């Protein structure tokens with residue numbers, strides 16, 4: 142059996158990967174909670190790699206937050222992500238771990254990128270300021286992977302998710318991520334018999350959403366492809382792979398779908414006196430498709446299962 | 456007296472800073488060689504900051520090299536610079552060091568930036584591939600400084616030099632940096648009575664060069680300006696300051712000047728069958744000038760003194 146370390150295994154993405162691999166009689170999972178292993182401590186991370194005989198790493202540990210957190214604690218987001226990724230990648234190489242998958246973010250891309258965003262949009266323009274420190278740390282993780290690949294002949298791959306949703310998200314009305322926020326807001330409005338739920342903006346911007354279990358499936362698929370196939374569809378210094386659906390949906394359609402999913406019978410209202418973001422933002426997933434993976438979970442089916450998860454975990 | 460840690464004090468830039476501050480009866484220098492303090496070791500760096508009562512840090516330690524090294528050892532250049540800067544900045548903040556100057560590189564700028572390059576060219580386009588890993592590590596250092604400034608109210612400033620030359624450079628014919636390489640090549644051609652020295656390219660590209668002692672002077676000037684004056688001339692998320700002359704010179708003029716400086720009486724020859732780089736590359740130093748510093752060392756005077764340094768240190 143392959144000994145697989147899922148860093149960050151209790152996180153939203155890491156736990157989705159663990160759920161699928163836990164079914165794999167060919168894999169032996171090696172898991173450490175934060176309390177057992179602080180990924181910021183270089184010595185502790187090296188001691189772990191020197192004693193645990195790992196074959197593969199899923200690097201799903203990160204300091205991640207929403208708009209308020211990213212603007213309020215920028216040093217936490219840059220410093221902690223730099224250190225976690227540098228520690229893990231360095232220790233993996235020192236202990237002859239040849240396979241690693243770095244799970245990043247779509248905040249890597251420029252604020253005004255061409256849509257849909259192909260992987261080659263990386264570094265083509267200015268970042269969103271809210272996420273800039275975090276994004277630079279994420280980009281440094283990709284470039285660590287590519288530099289170890291080039292200098293040492295490692296196989297350190299990387300995937301960048303689009304907006305994610307699903308079990309183990311933060312379902313609080315204040316979340317800046319629209320899916321969990323709206324699921325929660327509509328749930329509470331249906332409990333209260335509120336006449337309406339008002340969403341800021343016009344509802345016209347188009348966005349892209351992927352269920353976390355699809356993210357995990359794509360991630361395992363990308364990790365386990367033959368190296369020559371992964372090489373054919375990447376370039377050494379442009380190596381990351383976008384993971385998503387490649388399909389747009391208006392915030393209007395999303396909100397109306399959520400309202401149906403939850404059984405809300407009041408009105409969804411958009412307040413267009415508040416500003417919209419850019420008109421369209423989504424990943425180009427041609428590379429992923431070419432690599433033979435296509436998502437399985439449609440928005441309405443994924444929202445419904447995600448809401449059932451929330452219901453069972455209130 | 457202010458207790459000033461010059462990280463990297465034996466380096467080309469760090470030693471220039473040390474030469475000038477060593478004359479300052481208001482400053483107490485705290486210096487550690489690599490053998491005494493490995494800047495990659497987070498624990499050792501934190502122990503140093505916890506015991507040495509530092510007031511100011513000049514962060515001049517880095518893993519720096521030329522074209523062959525950057526392409527050959529990309530992981531060394533990204534990983535070591537990430538760790539040195541993350542360790543120092545984190546330990547400085549944990550121990551209430553409020554003032555720091557991060558000394559970076561002009562490789563931060565896009566390959567096809569607008570010339571002359573203002574600070575706002577950062578992140579506007581794709582990096583030069585040779586230096587990409589190094590450049591990302593450098594950019595992460597700026598963004599660490601800005602994030603600690605914003606989250607904690609620190610005063611972690613940053614300067615980006617143009618091409619540097621001067622004492623303590625590597626004067627080997629194989630250096631990819633044109634000034635030290637040409638000084639050495641012309642020195643050897645004058646020793647050998649070689650009829651000519653052939654330089655690849657046409658000699659038409661325009662480049663910018665700054666003597667290291669000017670770099671050090673500008674760096675100390677920027678570190679010691681009042682914070683409100685530094686704030687007036689920067690922005691929190693666009694905080695770095697270019698250090699240079701702002702003036703172009705053709706590689707032709709440079710080579711002919713070097714030949715005169717060394718006393719070569721053979722011919723300088725350009726072989727235009729070999730390709731040139733971009734036609735023009737230099738920093739816009741308006742911000743530095745506005746902050747009241749202007750370079751003092753002209754090219755011919757700086758080449759002559761630098762050659763006299765080489766002569767005395769063969």
Ligand SMILES: NC(=O)c1ccc[n+]([C@@H]2O[C@H](COP(=O)([O-])OP(=O)(O)OC[C@H]3O[C@@H](n4cnc5c(N)ncnc54)[C@H](OP(=O)(O)O)[C@@H]3O)[C@@H](O)[C@H]2O)c1
Nearest residue numbers: 149151152153154155175179180181202203205206207305
């Ligand atoms: N506040 C937000 O809006 C928010 C936050 C997280 C996730 N999300 C949603 O979930 C999506 C995916 O999140 P994600 O899975 O990347 O993040 P995540 O759910 O926060 O998972 C990151 C995992 O890394 C662990 N970790 C962080 N630092 C560690 C350290 N020093 N040592 C060991 N473990 C460490 C975290 O543990 P600890 O929790 O113990 O720190 C956590 O289990 C995000 O894109 C967003 O859609 C939203």
Ligand SMILES: NC(=O)c1ccc[n+]([C@@H]2O[C@H](COP(=O)([O-])OP(=O)(O)OC[C@H]3O[C@@H](n4cnc5c(N)ncnc54)[C@H](OP(=O)(O)O)[C@@H]3O)[C@@H](O)[C@H]2O)c1
Nearest residue numbers: 463465466467468469489493494495516517519520521619
């Ligand atoms: N090969 C090249 O072409 C080359 C190399 C260096 C400088 N330069 C010229 O000099 C210009 C400025 O160079 P620079 O001053 O930034 O570089 P530098 O002269 O190499 O100085 C960097 C200093 O940091 C020290 N350092 C690096 N890692 C360290 C660690 N882990 N612990 C403690 N000390 C550490 C180095 O010590 P150690 O030497 O002991 O590693 C060195 O003293 C470059 O732009 C170029 O013009 C050229």
